[PDB]
């Protein structure tokens, strides 16, 4: 366990090597930040309650992801049946219809969550509980918040007529609250991957207060900080379009990317034999890498490195592509027989969508929301991403701390 | 019979109640519109010329739709063979892949019937001898005899440089002719779920007497009206455009809604619970509730419950939803074997785009023809829902009287 | 060989007949044009190392698709499987899931390849070596040999500050290199169909001469000429998404047209039988039309009527619908057994964008780039049209020549 506290501290370690200003870092702040992601972590990770608490919810999850199964099981029929694993085998789970149409119908239900206002109810609720503690402003409380649920481009609409005034860490911590936590929408997506919805769920509450934390210590705030559809059935169809857009935006780049990705092993293999390496791929590219950052964060010595291919690939590209890779070693079909707390740090790692293309993705969601801010956006764009993966990073260690 | 007549009088009641001046409501309009439908419901439903031409003009469209069907054979292969039925059996029918390419072939042929003049040569011989029964106005005649083939927002186009100047009976009648109707596309998409053509073109065609109808009885005149693609190939390639996003669109939604009501269900399954009655279901609530006004419209009282669900269903969401319901109702594997009146009166009830989303999309697509009029739209929107609704349910009384 | 040599001039002749004026084209211009096309025909198709080169680029495009393929082997899991074809047979090719996803893959790694100034590189070299010897501007130059590798839209954008100055020559020559040529994303598309990419990527670069070639013969130079993603990852999910609009517009486009032929076919068989030709179909018009064409490019007399079925399809459509009839008569199960010259032929004379849809897409994609030179685009369209053609039939017949 000595291995995960010097972990947690060589993470806090960088974000203030890294600040703007290690002198303006409210100890307060950042103190109880960690200290609510420690103890979140060892609540529903650790203790008794805590953890029936988690099962309950992600089982409450597991039911509402298994109820918009109804809506592709209609559109697919067949395809998306028992048969087609006879027919196939391991090649009947068609990921265009078991995993693609899940965006939509979560982001149908999300919408509808919203026009209730029940969403809305629960955010006022953990994002006025930040800032009371934090001393946080509440703008980015409730972005933070938010962000559990909901894309990073989604959650400062809470507070959309208070982005454009607000101070630079303001921005910077909810650029943060996105890049370090995922979406309703693929979480459920991952999970019908195989990635265990315990491990998404924890991990997008761990990073209200985790990405609160590394925002507040790269970017302390030195400034002083301020303070519909019709009916339910169009915000039902509002969140389906939204749904379907997104839905067809991942399919067109995992088709793209991992045909990349076997493009660039096919060259690296011919490069590579140039050096006596001809079975040169880019997962041992990254998993080299990676695999110093994977064995700090309390993963084994002898899988450091495979864990590194998969940490690394969600940093060079995106968590979609990794998680893609990482979960048949979660089946009994795995080259690679992984510990479960190795599994459980990998996809706790994972968990984020902080990559360098989401910083085009901050300018274009969170930019048409303050134009004036355009600038700003893409100036803490790459210390945000850091600042996300930290978050990601963290979460990982304190997970495979109390496993 | 008498239950039917009764029928027909409680609708137009509702209508005379419900009207924004019922002093002003033109007799001779409302008369023979009333009458027109009722003869045209007696021409091709009864007497035995007008059966052929109603069997004749059915027999035409579902060529015309195994035709398309070449095209969506050539992208999607065996998926969409007969082999489809012996591997996998009543989930060999893959909805994506036989009904929605319909929608895209459908919007091409009537945008090359558009550039050749073909619908407008139609339209103007059917909505001129409206204008010269009715005394409505030459626009608001014209749009409701487009709304017989094309969509509600695709309807007006015919007549747009006359829609931001028209009065607020023309365009309450133009908005109704939209909400009592459907269009061409999606007509075959649901004659390929087993609904019977002949009930479509039938009810498509008595849309625009009804249209009028209800719109010269709620919200009749006291106002004074007034008064392309480069080529061919353009022209289908436009609307093949728009039809794959219709095609997008419509796809989404059922994959959310049947996926949201598989959500809801679960939900009154446990809040029902609490009263004793965990069998509870959407069904059952729409059914109990829509099964009076369907055992008004001539449902037998055994059949007015299950008919109620449908009927009710097509109105607190839309009619694809509710067709998607009621096609297994119309094979030998339906769960409740309904007589041949019921299965009409059905289908000429859910014939239509008569719901609450359709106000937004009316705010959208007619909007954007007159900007300066989407507050007139958004006023008038609840009654002209309301409207549309009375007149599919005359439709479906008309049906089950002469049958 | 006397039938093809005649061929060519009879394509040159049509060129100088169609001219603006005749007695302004440069004789060095279109001489070198010829010569460098009817060389580069000679060197790949005809002498040993040149036969090489061709077979080494095109076994490299074939691995490059096969590396794409693992993305779509990932989405569509066992449906696009070897399964597939013990199940359904030939069915069991879903051109969906098969060819289409290849559009987005292709067009991510061209992305690519722009941001690492791969295509500049290239093009520089190609563009710089046409205008040394045909006295061609810089601009025109360069979006002649981007056209080998890029759409027609796409390749101004190399030149894109350039265009809306440049001269009605250059605009119409820019407009010729894209009607004469196809993009690599189709390319790929057509191979994936059984399409010999021997023959598309020998098509391919004879377009940047031969596009010049009937530019500068029915338009030639009486003015004077004058003189970006934040990452690599970015730029191929701009790619993928750019691909991904391309993918859907082509499979809803031939669903549409496909099925649109086939409803033409069943009128043309009424119609017909009114003459005593019942088995008229438009297989036979534009096989009995574009036969003496066919004839005179180089196909056998009793291949010539077959051969102008999917030549004149590719006209009055497009490429892409054209290359779908033809592909069956590549393989085994093929009605009519073609020679190999023959197959050659169809192959070049197919590969191009040179069809009177084109005129709409060239208003819009190289109309943005200059929106007060739309009026000269649409006038000279018809002309670009035809200039295109020919180059694909010139291309067509010195493949014939050497074969
Ligand atoms: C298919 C998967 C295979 C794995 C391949 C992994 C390769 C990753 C390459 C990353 O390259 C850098 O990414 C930054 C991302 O933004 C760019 O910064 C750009 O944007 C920054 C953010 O604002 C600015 O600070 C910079 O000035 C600006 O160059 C930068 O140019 C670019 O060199
Ligand atoms: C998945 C299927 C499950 C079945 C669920 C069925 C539930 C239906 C709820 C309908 O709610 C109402 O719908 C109106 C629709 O427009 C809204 O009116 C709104 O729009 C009207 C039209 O202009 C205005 O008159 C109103 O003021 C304005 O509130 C209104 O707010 C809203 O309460
Ligand atoms: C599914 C496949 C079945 C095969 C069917 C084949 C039928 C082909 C019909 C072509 O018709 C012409 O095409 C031109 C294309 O542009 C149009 O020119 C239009 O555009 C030109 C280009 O600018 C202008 O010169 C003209 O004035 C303008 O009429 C023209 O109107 C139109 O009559
Ligand atoms: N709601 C969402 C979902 C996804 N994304 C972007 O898509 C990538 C893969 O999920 C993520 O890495 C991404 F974050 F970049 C997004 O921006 N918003
Ligand atoms: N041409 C069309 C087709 C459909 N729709 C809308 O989609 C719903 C289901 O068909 C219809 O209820 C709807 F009407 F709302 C539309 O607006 N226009
Ligand atoms: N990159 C591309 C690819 C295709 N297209 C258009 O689509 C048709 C069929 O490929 C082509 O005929 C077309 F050229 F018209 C295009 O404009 N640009
Ligand atoms: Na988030
Ligand atoms: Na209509
Ligand atoms: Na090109």
Known sequence: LFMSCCGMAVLLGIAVLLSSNRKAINLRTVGGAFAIQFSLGAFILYVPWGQELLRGFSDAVSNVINYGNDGTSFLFGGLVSGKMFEVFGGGGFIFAFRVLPTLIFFSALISVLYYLGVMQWVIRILGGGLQKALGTSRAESMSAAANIFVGQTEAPLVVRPFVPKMTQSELFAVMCGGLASIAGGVLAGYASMGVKIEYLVAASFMAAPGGLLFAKLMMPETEKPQDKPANVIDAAAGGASAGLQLALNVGAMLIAFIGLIALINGMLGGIGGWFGMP?????????????????????????????????????????????????????????????????????????????????????????????????????????????????????????????
Do not use: H
């Open 279 to 403: 079975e040169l791929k880019l997962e041992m590219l990254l998993g080299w890498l990676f695999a110093p950052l994977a064995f700090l964060i309390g993963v084994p010595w002898n899988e450091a490195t495979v864990a590194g291919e998969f940490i690394g690939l969600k940093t060079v590209a995106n968590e979609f592509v990794a998680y893609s890779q990482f979960a048949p070693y979660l089946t009994e079909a795995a080259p690679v027989v992984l510990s479960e707390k190795t599994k459980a740090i990998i996809s706790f790692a994972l968990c984020g969508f902080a990559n360098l293309s989401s910083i085009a993705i901050l300018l274009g969601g969170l930019g048409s929301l303050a134009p004036k801010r355009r600038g700003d956006i893409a100036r803490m764009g790459v210390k945000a991403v850091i600042a996300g993966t930290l978050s990601n990073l963290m979460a990982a260690t304190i997970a495979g701390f109390f496993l």
